[PDB]
């Protein structure tokens, strides 16, 4: 019974919540007292839990949601394709992961993942996302975006505790939302490349992607691989080795060589794209 779980009932204190839809691959969350979509940082978008079950029956949405500020002391780390088929942690950094930070625990809405809800701070020398090579993922937020509750508890684990973070550190990569400012343009311009399927030649279609990155970023080749290694056309072999480098890297270089213009945001140049959209 969702409503008699800890975790939710001090989130139920919060009037920060969204109900969403699938569409496609994405979770698109909406505002629960009009059923229109929602601003992650306008307040007056969001309702409490009582809406939002309302507004989830109202317009038949696919679960409830909870949107992060800086305010508020939850911090949301999410532990992606980390299960196996019988709801088990196939992964090991995964498993480390929850034997060092205990707390409110449920699995994603696909299945295959976990949601962590913890009462703290993030340390503020890690990234957001971190990709690791088998397939899994950690990804850290405490404001600015919105997370689905489920309900649907890992481990008996349904209390939100207060805890240090700085084990994260383990795990999370160290740093020293404007890739996803060119990540957004790019799928709104329609350049953002479908996963391939049957007949496709793959490492074409990297060239012709590299082409509009070098573009978009403007030849940041970093940038570029960066926004590559988040894309549907990545792989194992962007990193074998090749020559004296990787496929990836040599690819990256070549079209960073080939284009001839570049996107400026003070000239406001979207049209000057030379590739036409997917």
Known sequence: ??????????????????????????????????????????????????????????????????????????????????????????????????????????????????????????????????????????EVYESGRYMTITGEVFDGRDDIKELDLSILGEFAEHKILDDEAIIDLMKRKGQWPDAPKDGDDWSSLDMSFANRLAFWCGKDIERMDRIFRQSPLMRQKWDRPTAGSTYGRITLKKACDFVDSVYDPALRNESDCPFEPY
């Open 1 to 138: 019974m969702i409503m008699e779980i800890p975790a939710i009932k001090a989130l139920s204190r919060y009037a920060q919540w969204v109900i969403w839809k699938k569409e496609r691959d994405t979770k698109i969350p909406y505002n629960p007292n009009n059923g229109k979509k929602a601003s992650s940082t306008d307040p007056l978008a969001w309702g409490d839990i009582d809406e939002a079950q309302a507004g989830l029956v109202r317009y038949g949405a696919n679960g409830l949601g909870f949107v992060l500020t800086k305010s508020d002391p939850f911090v949301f780390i999410d532990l992606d394709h980390v299960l196996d088929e019988n709801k088990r942690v196939k992964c090991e950094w995964a498993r480390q992961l929850l034997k060092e930070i205990k707390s409110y625990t449920e699995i994603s809405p696909s299945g295959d993942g976990l949601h962590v809800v913890v009462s703290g701070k993030l340390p503020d020398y890690i990234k957001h996302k971190t990709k690791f090579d088998d397939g899994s993922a950690l």
